[PDB]
Symmetry: C3
Subunit: 111 residues, 3 copies
């Protein structure tokens, strides 16, 4: 049924909690939905193992939500896959993945 | 012809005036366009009866613009439909409505 | 192949550099992609001849990136085409152009 990819590139608290809230809201309002969360730039800090949002990220991952980190930004930010929480996947490009997804018919949400 | 849904989740002045401006600009640049404005989180404060933007909201409603408040956020914010300006509609979910709309072919704008 | 239009309506440094970075990242991660950057409101200041980002804008233009300024905002901002960097094009409406593009199948990215 529904397919949607979220986009977050900041790590300020209110924006992060809004994304989280939007992801949960969406899973409850739509019968069937596939969700991906693409985070790049400062936004990747949310996917770090030492992140204050790790509980939220690990829990949603268990519910089928796929979090994607940008292969490029990572380097740019002195980060590698070892710094990311378990369950978080890496895509070659945050924006590229978003464009591919949109091109494949996925809906786009930028909280 | 054209169908577009706007997304606003903040209530800071500059962002609100930008949305308003974008809605009017759009109605003047496109021959035929159907417009919906989905506001959630802090963004719903813009749809309140006591809002400083009530004049702008009521006027655009008269021009065919449909403003939608999130059924969930409302509660979360200690609000119910009685707190909303007349003409403002309530959708079950702000993000869900946006995803359904995008899925139905509507364009998406996030000022 | 891929077609994408970026949307920027602010001129704060971090947001501008993020857009620039996203445009370059995209050109390197996608084999074939057509890119347009629509800037309105404060965002048009980025397309000014006297802008600190002129080097970045002129360079990307040479690489095929099309920057578009909003015909309306310009006036609203006491600006005309003479104030814009060479290579920057003017569209009748920033949001309208974005809606037309999305309607034509282009992907949308709002950094």
């Amino acid at each position: 049924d529904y397919r949607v990819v979220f986009h977050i590139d900041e790590d300020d608290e209110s924006r992060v909690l809004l994304l989280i809230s939007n992801v949960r809201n969406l899973m409850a309002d739509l019968e069937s939905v596939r969700i991906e969360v693409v985070a790049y730039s400062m936004g990747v800090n949310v996917l770090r193992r030492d992140s204050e949002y790790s509980g939220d990220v690990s829990e949603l991952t268990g519910q089928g939500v796929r979090f994607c980190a940008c292969s490029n930004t990572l380097r740019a930010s002195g980060m590698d896959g070892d710094d990311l929480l378990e369950g978080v996947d890496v895509v070659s490009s945050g924006v590229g993945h978003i464009v591919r997804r949109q091109t494949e018919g996925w809906a786009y949400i930028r909280p």
